[PDB]
Amino acid sequence: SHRKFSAPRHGSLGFLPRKRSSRHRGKVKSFPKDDPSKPVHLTAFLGYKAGMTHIVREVDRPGSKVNKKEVVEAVTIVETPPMVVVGIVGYVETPRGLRTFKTVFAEHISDECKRRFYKNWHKSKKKAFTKYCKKWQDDAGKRQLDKDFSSMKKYCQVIRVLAHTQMRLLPLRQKKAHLMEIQVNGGTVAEKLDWARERLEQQVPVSQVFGQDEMIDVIGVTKGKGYKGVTSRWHTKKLPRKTHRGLRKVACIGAWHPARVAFSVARAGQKGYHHRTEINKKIYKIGQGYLIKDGKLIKNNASTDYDLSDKSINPLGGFVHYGEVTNDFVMLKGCVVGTKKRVLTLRKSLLVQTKRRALEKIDLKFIDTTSKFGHGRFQTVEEKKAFMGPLKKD
């Protein structure tokens, strides 16, 4: 007979192949739709999740009970050093889909980028792009390079550019840079490909791509949790205590006679390390890198307009399980997807943003840089010293 009391499902069937995603870097499944009305720009970036902290700001949304008051928001710091362009890749609109037309690479590719085309870099001879790079040093080699462009503004329609990460600068173990196809949106195909060739072998900072108070979408693989059971994975009801074989499971896995087990029944397997795409993550501020002018290194990234003090966004003991944030960063609202150190694909919004919550203007009063390796009290080393006086070490 029928279900006695109506309950919803446990979990979604929209994210159903709950397997380890074969990619470690977040693939952009859909780039934003362009119109040749706009000037040419990049539509995605490649950041590194450093960690999380507080913010204090005055909220401007009229009518609400939080209007003209202060709040405390969880913000996530993604360190984003400038990305290097190494190649352009053409696409043609085919009745079977959208086919890659012609790739053209740059002359000089840094070893950090070259590492991506290897598994065993130590055992290798670094011989990649030794005969491609020749094609810029020659007269006859040029006359393919030049006609490979003339063919691509004639036939090819969608133009994407091959950026890579400067892993040289980042405080991680790894040096093997991440390549990423970023779609060059904006004006017409001639204007677009003349731009992309000028920006070839150069760097793109984050101020070029993402502005301030811009609703972006973050693409990343989730944090892994290994082989989890049904009540750990699908979050079903636990069975009550007196159950012989096990109380941490689904009791009935289907009726008699649709005589197979359905795809919709909650089983045990891999939990976490899934490809996910959260939307509407509001950028609060883009910081600055560790500049050296006058000889004196300036590091006042987290200095707001109501502090005036020379504290970095690095809290006491840096970021836990990551390291020290020395490069230009983005700072979004709330939680984002995946572990500390995790490579994170920041993409422009698919939608239009015409709200109050979407066009809200941010004005950070305070950034918390108290230690996250314990219950921290002191913002700066000069606060802690001024409070606690001299010690025995002194």
**Residues between 85 and 104 that touch RNA (CB under 7 A):** 92, 94-96, 99, 101
Of 45, 91, 195, 273, which lies in the binding site for RNA, with binding defined by CB under 7 A? 273
Of 7, 140, 352, 391, which lies in the binding site for RNA, with binding defined by CB under 7 A? 7
Of 77, 158, 250, 346, which lies in the binding site for RNA, with binding defined by CB under 7 A? 250
Of 155, 168, 309, 334, which lies in the binding site for RNA, with binding defined by CB under 7 A? 155
Site string for RNA, 26-65 (x = CB under 7 A): ----------------------------------------
Q: For residue 336, give the nearest of 271, 281, 286 by alpha carbon.
A: 281
Q: For residue 180, give the nearest of 26, 350, 4 by alpha carbon.
A: 26
Beta carbon of residue 108, minimum distance to RNA (angstroms, whole number): 18
Burial of 266 (0-12, 13-18, 19+ CB in 10 A): middle
Q: Which long-range contacts (CB under 8 A, 24 or more apart) does 190-199 make?
A: 190/153, 191/40, 192/40, 192/159, 193/88, 193/149, 193/152, 193/153, 193/159, 195/40, 196/85, 196/88, 196/159, 196/161, 197/88, 197/149, 199/85, 199/161
Position 25 contacts RNA (CB under 7 A)? no
Count of residues engaged in binding RNA, rule: CB under 7 A? 75
Residues in region 106-125 near RNA by CB under 7 A: 118-120, 123-125
Beta carbon of residue 338, minimum distance to RNA (angstroms, whole number): 6
- Whichever of 101 and 195 has its CB closer to RNA, that residue is 101
Position 9 contacts RNA (CB under 7 A)? yes
Token digits of residue 86: 């190494």
Residues in region 363-392 near RNA by CB under 7 A: none
Residues in region 158-197 near RNA by CB under 7 A: 172-174
CA dihedral 144, 150, 154, 159 (to 10 degrees): 90
Of 24, 61, 134, 377, which lies in the binding site for RNA, with binding defined by CB under 7 A? 24
Beta carbon of residue 238, minimum distance to RNA (angstroms, whole number): 12
Position 249 contacts RNA (CB under 7 A)? yes
- Whichever of 215 and 332 has its CB closer to RNA, that residue is 332
Residues in region 292-311 near RNA by CB under 7 A: none
User: In sequence order, which residues have a C-beta less than 8 Å from that of residue 158 and are 6 or more positions away?
Assistant: 90, 91, 93, 98, 183
8-state DSSP, 134: G
Q: Are 93 and 56 in contact (CB under 8 A)?
A: no
Residues in region 314-343 near RNA by CB under 7 A: 321, 338-343
Residues in region 194-233 near RNA by CB under 7 A: 223-227, 232
Tell me the CB-side half-sphere exposure of residue 89, using CA atoms within 13 A.
14
- Whichever of 126 and 377 has its CB closer to RNA, that residue is 126
Tell me the CB-side half-sphere exposure of residue 13, using CA atoms within 13 A.
7
Q: For residue 288, give the nearest of 272, 276, 299, 279 by alpha carbon.
A: 299
- Whichever of 20 and 61 has its CB closer to RNA, that residue is 20
Of 110, 236, 270, 277, which lies in the binding site for RNA, with binding defined by CB under 7 A? 270
Q: Are 340 and 50 in contact (CB under 8 A)?
A: yes
Q: What share of the chain is helix, strand, coil (3-state, %, to 5)?
A: 10, 25, 60
